[PDB]
């Protein structure tokens, strides 16, 4: 039946591998609490050491489910088998369920806090599938579902940047701001999730959401040679190379050597030319993408009217550690420990470089723009990467290849928003008084993954991801990677190869 | 199914625009508590500084839903689009739902108060659609549903004026009052909402109410010229003007000038002649509508046996600030801050004046009564106005045009009354003892709005409501109008045009 | 007699919308990021490895294309544009400058914010207008997909990149056309072309 | 019927707004005269102050209708309403008529 | 929140007698031209867009 | 703008005139090398021969 004593779902988990598809199933226990005391608020974060960088933030009384990472949908076993056995994969269909909800009242009698459920209390659930509201999720956020199925998932408050602050900040000689800055505030949108229709559930209820992906494949393959090596060294070429007079060397006309043939295929795009600009508390990137309408007043540097573009490097080989993708494996990691620095996948469509001859030597071209006949592989994503990102709605765009490796889509999976229904309290003083409550429940995500198995005429063995590439750590230093410790600590991958990137194992004939 | 752990509704919100209709959807979380300790009481409010003004008030153990304002049914975005894109609109159908009810018991153990729900407790809901009881709502009350969907709605106690007090007050030389005043008390009606059949709901239940409007349109259009300018200046007129002898000027007979033709259309009605009478604690209006049967004893002035008629001015141009419509934007506003003074809509069917020649000059006619051939536009309502008012049941009436702009109807939307069901407590002393409880729940209002799009042969652009007409305020003074502040404070419109009145944007050929 | 002519358009939309934020602001400031920023040693400042601040997240979306680097070349009676697109086959004799074997490319600026009045779209409203009267200078639409800029850090400050070519992951809005604009233009017949986005706003 | 004293058309004008389409109608009185005395000619414009810039121009005994601007198809009222009420627009079908010739 | 729209209040006044508003005819019959770019009513101004 | 120079919307196609060939003729001599240089490799040569 249905009621308070009947569960609305069950635990779903594991994976199913087939030839043409993989089904991953993940359930988590999540917790949500009241945010902003049921208020919408617009705050200005303006760090003193932020070197003039600022944000406007509308914080909402809402929290949201973020499913975007690979590690949350794949065990390390399943990710290994995925990247070892398949040439490519993409998401096919997502199904998420929120069920087994429990709304407890929080009673503070003192230092001791007690918990008893309000059976008539309720919870708001809203999935935004048309992206009618500012997107909650962003790639590489820590809000994502946990990797370990038995770890609790704590939802993060939803907030959005209503405006670019330095454009709206009403600073300058004139009082009240310039005419252009005021015009940019006079229209600053304000979004409330309460403006949409959505669901209110009690403990005996549940909700489910389906999403259909239509996506480009994630290709797991490596180029064993660059596109320039695709010729045959033994056959001569008809091509002639003329070399102009250089100093005392006479100009010559000769047949190009058989072992260097000319290539038609350029280095992929990328920027090696920029450099990060401290301090670390500002936005530090080799490149800022800025918007600066005419008539605004800017008292800061490029950071703070613009966003840092990172990784700047494309398929180009990073010439410095600043250009490499890097992330901390846990939220408690700081400094040089817990960080994973990306290393080459040893694919020959990656780590490209472009040199121009000055007729003496070749010198590196740092900034490689889009140019015809460019051939490159997209970034070698690992088990920890964002799966997707939100593609901005715009008139025009170039080739969409986010350098972090996430897949940009017009409509990604919609964000499911959840908040505690407000339970007002009588107040003789007309104060705003609500009952303190929280919801815990079980959220499951089933994703169907369309996959393709490789076929190779290669005679020789190929690289595969092996547990022998794992490292040993822990409190007692006996615990291998992706295993729990004596304290229950989950041993994180130390290095980029332990994250099992794609575009490593399976060779590819160009 | 149905029960304590199953929600009886969901959150509905937003708007839907079409050509011939607009659907607005609004849900609020409301709270109600016990009123008058479950008693009916008749109180006499007789302020010492009220300058002899008094009221009889029957206060009831009831609270009521008030949906009458435009701002509660329209976001400022939706109101803008309504008044920019449509020549006229009226309400079509209302649907309200009370659901997701929670009755909590209030436990006071000390300075600390605890809240736990009584699942078998219940709540009375009564909609009066025949207006069999004194109307709860009145235009420009603060009891109305909030503008922000996430703000809690606190219901107000229902009460009504049983009688005009100075007529019933039994004052005079004779003891016990005159014969006429006693006769006016001997019949003073007394109304109990318990006399009607109505619904009692528990948490697992819900109720809904439908109402069908049949209304006059709210016309959003402006006259670019007065009705007197409707002639052609270049064609001569046949009309003759005779001017009698004035002093040493000889009487003349001549053809009226082509650029002044006579008009058939009089100034609309209005009173510029009255003045408010202090102090502010009495009823201060330029005009009192009084009832004074013969045989009553009146020891006071006109105020207190009568009601102030405000705005006194009709379509007539207010000659003083006293004659202008004015309101505070929030309940905490006092004095000169937070008040919005109405300003001209620059429609030429508004701000009318009437002068009579004394044969030397023209002098203003202050009081313009109904006269044949009068042409005027009804008040330019804003997003904050009452939508409707209750029209009194009476034998005879003149043209119904409330000067505040609210639409008078024989039957407006019925008032939904709600109170906490009394939960008596055993008392050995035969005291009246009840259990202290309150109800919070979700109330939704869907209104279908019949609309009409304008068509114009005007070549030139027309005025529209723009966000660039908004102003910037807040604690940090960075927050634009209709946006939330850092504290969560909602920035109120400072001026009358920011309230986006009608009869401004869309020109009209007379 | 009389004649009539019908034509059927198949066209891209003219989009009337504004971005209230740039594509770089699409994150949530309150949630932390996993991303690490390594800053190399600069002078006496030590190299540091730290978590990127929550209020600056890295963006995947580059500034749209444009040229801020060129400048018009007088006199006004020649072809004066920041850029000449020229054709110069081998064997021709050219006794002139770049103007006159080539055509001026104007507006040079893309979605990039014009850094000078030369880069702004400008026209006279009537055929009799001359000089500084009757001219309409384009001003920002206050859309955040317009007026873009690109800076590269030298590890001390950020310096403007004047010429922004096509680069992957670029996001921009097409020019904010007005009631006086060409609706369409003729697209040249050619083998190859890049993204077609005439900077005046006309639809090729 | 048809002849010298029968008009071949009428004045069409205005706009019609709907949800999914807008119809703009514009009629003009046009004038054309003889060009180049009925000759094709190839002229070289080579301004002395043109700083070496020149053009070859084939001028024809022909004139042409140019409909390409937005302001010619939209009144300022209609353009306002277009840009206020709609997120996007594109041309769908054009129909032009030359008639009432003298 | 409300959004920007094109308004006749953004027009300017000019003419021979300087009484004629934009997009209106003058005493001579001269049609008053838009002085500034916003009076030409550009697109990508009024209607906000969620990216 | 003069009637005989109108602004053009159409840019020059792509190309590289900036590079120069690097002798001797027995090596790979081109104005530009497209190279692949993964991190951790050892290169004792110039751009030619890893590209």
Residue numbers in the entry:
A (entry chain A), B (entry chain B): 33 to 542
C (entry chain I): 237 to 440
D (entry chain I): 33 to 134
E (entry chain I): 492 to 542
F (entry chain G): 288 to 338
Sentences from the paper on this structure:
Gorilla bocavirus 1 (GBoV1) is a member of the genus Bocaparvovirus in the Parvoviridae that contain single-stranded DNA (ssDNA) packaging viruses. The structural proteins that form the viral capsid, VP1, VP2 and VP3, are encoded by the cap gene. Sixty copies of VP1, VP2 and VP3 assemble one T = 1 icosahedral capsid in an approximate 1:1:10 ratio in 2-, 3-, 5-related symmetries. GBoV1 is an alternative to HBoV1, as it is capable of also infecting the apical side of pHAE efficiently, package 5.5 kb and less susceptible to neutralization by pooled intravenous immunoglobulin (IVIgs).
